[PDB]
Curated annotation (Swiss-Prot), chain B:
It comes from Escherichia coli (strain K12). Its EC number is 2.5.1.90. Mg(2+) 1 binds at residue 84. Supplies octaprenyl diphosphate, the precursor for the side chain of the isoprenoid quinones ubiquinone and menaquinone. SUPFAM superfamilies: Terpenoid synthases (SSF48576). GO terms for biological process: isoprenoid biosynthetic process; polyprenol biosynthetic process; ubiquinone biosynthetic process. This is Octaprenyl diphosphate synthase. It comes from the Bacteria. The keyword Methyltransferase does not apply. Isopentenyl diphosphate binds at residues 45, 48, 77. It holds the Pfam family polyprenyl_synt. Binds 2 Mg(2+) ions per subunit. The keyword Disulfide bond does not apply.
Length: 293, 259
């Protein structure tokens, strides 16, 4: 149950890709150029893949679920263009970033086009509820990024709450809005909502562990990610100082306990997904959680 | 009319706009908190939101949703300025991102798919006009006479969407909608033309040896731009007879723009 997902979701994932490329049709070449650069530059497309998978797991058989998948990837794509500017990164998972190749202003402004274009794509579906659920999702995420910019700083519960209510809100919306467009049942809606929130949290926790094993940027700016926290006065300083440069080698110490914590959530999402019909789609959906970790 | 009449006749509507603006920017983060009082709600003329409030009340509106579009319109405008200040700061993008997203949220609260359809396209058009102008920097050759296509989709499309969406959200006749649409379209263009007058090099402005480069050295005092700006204003005032004190302000505002 790993390659089955791709094989099963193949037919529908080729439409989302087509839909994403359809939107890049501005008269301004730069928008299209930068757009083709990041989108066609290799990506695992979990977020649109959750969207299509969620809708057909509750019996949808139009094609609007590819559009909801497509604008979600646009949102995520627009988000990465802005994150590669604030993180001042040179390369995003392999090749160089858009700000490197194209400049900071172009990558920022093309992100605006891409996001606002996802918003028009959202309007055309004509559902006010999906517009509300996602608009607050992306505003909640945007506000937390401003908060991390202005205030550095933790209770296990509290830390997780932030992710549940902010960081992994796009994942949650992705699955929840997919089912809302497919006219699912309130019970199913929560399932997808819960599934999203949790699978995003495990994926977010799992993404904060691959930074150690572009290695070390979490440490190289004082960012309290779950592995980091727990003679260890050299770790507290960095967090408070806001700088942990030159410390990726002498950080092992205890070494994780976050993989089991991410597993908990991975399984947590699975539990909430047992409220909808046993279908290949559902199997695939559940399979993703396992693979997320 | 005149300035004083306008301010006095819009004071009540503007107060709600500020409340809406302040009610939406009451986040915990101080950065966002201080932005609702600094460089907004005092100082500037704030014609944009002023176009919004008067456009709706000139067609017989008497709810309060026209104040929310006025606020989000200013939010849209603030976010572009924040994104245009970037080689660029992290704070300018993320506060812009926040404001942008907030504006979308406010547009959705109005429950009208048509303003969402118009508004959504409006912000996507101005976002493509910033990139366009971004690649039009340090280039006097390609600019030609297609520099009006950048000022329309960047500055004048937000005016148009403000008035036209104010009209639809007041349930107006389809040719009053086209009137305010053209009024925003033309006055917004008149606004930019007059705003490109004197200071900041490296920008192929309408007024046009050359050597487009980064250095403060200009003195040739030899205006068509001003004269051309007035023209559009006339076209803006023209399409507005399709009245009332609120309509006078709109016309008056146009005149004021070309002072
Ligand atoms: O959070 P990280 O920087 O660790 C990362 O996951 C990328 C990322 C994840 C989640 C949100 C964001 C992000 C960053 C900057 C701005 C914005 C982000 O998400 C939104 C949504 C809406 C507006 C702005 C932003 C970036 P990474 O790929 O750099 O590891
Ligand atoms: Mg980041």
């Amino acid at each position: 149950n790993l390659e089955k997902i791709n094989e099963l979701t193949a037919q529908d994932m080729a439409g989302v890709n087509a839909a994403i490329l359809e939107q890049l049709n501005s008269d301004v070449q730069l928008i299209n150029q930068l757009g083709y650069y990041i989108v066609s530059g290799g990506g695992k497309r979990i977020r649109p893949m959750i969207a299509v998978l969620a809708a057909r797991a509750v019996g949808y058989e139009g094609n609007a679920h590819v559009t909801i998948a497509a604008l979600i990837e646009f949102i995520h794509t627009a988000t990465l263009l802005h994150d590669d500017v604030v993180d001042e990164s040179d390369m995003r998972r392999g090749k160089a970033t858009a700000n490197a190749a194209f400049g900071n202003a172009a990558s920022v402004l093309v992100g605006d086009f891409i996001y606002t274009r996802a918003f028009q794509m959202m309007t055309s579906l004509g559902s006010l509820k999906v517009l509300e659920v996602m608009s607050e999702a992306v505003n909640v995420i945007a506000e937390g990024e401003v908060l991390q910019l202005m205030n550095v700083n933790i209770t296990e519960e509290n830390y997780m709450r932030v992710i549940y209510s902010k960081t992994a809100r796009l994942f949650e919306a992705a699955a929840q809005c997919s089912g809302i467009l497919a006219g699912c049942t309130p019970e199913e809606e929560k399932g997808l909502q819960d599934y999203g929130r949790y699978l995003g949290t495990a994926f977010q926790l799992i993404d904060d562990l691959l930074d150690y094993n572009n290695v070390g940027d979490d440490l190289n700016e004082g960012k309290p990610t779950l592995p980091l926290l727990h003679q260890a006065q050299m770790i507290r300083t960095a967090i408070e100082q806001g700088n942990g440069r030159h410390l990726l080698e002498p950080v092992l110490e205890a070494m994780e306990w976050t993989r089991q914590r991410a597993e908990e959530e991975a399984d947590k999402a699975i539990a909430a997904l047992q409220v909808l019909p046993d279908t290949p789609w559902r199997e695939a959906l559940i399979g993703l959680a396992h693979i997320a970790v």
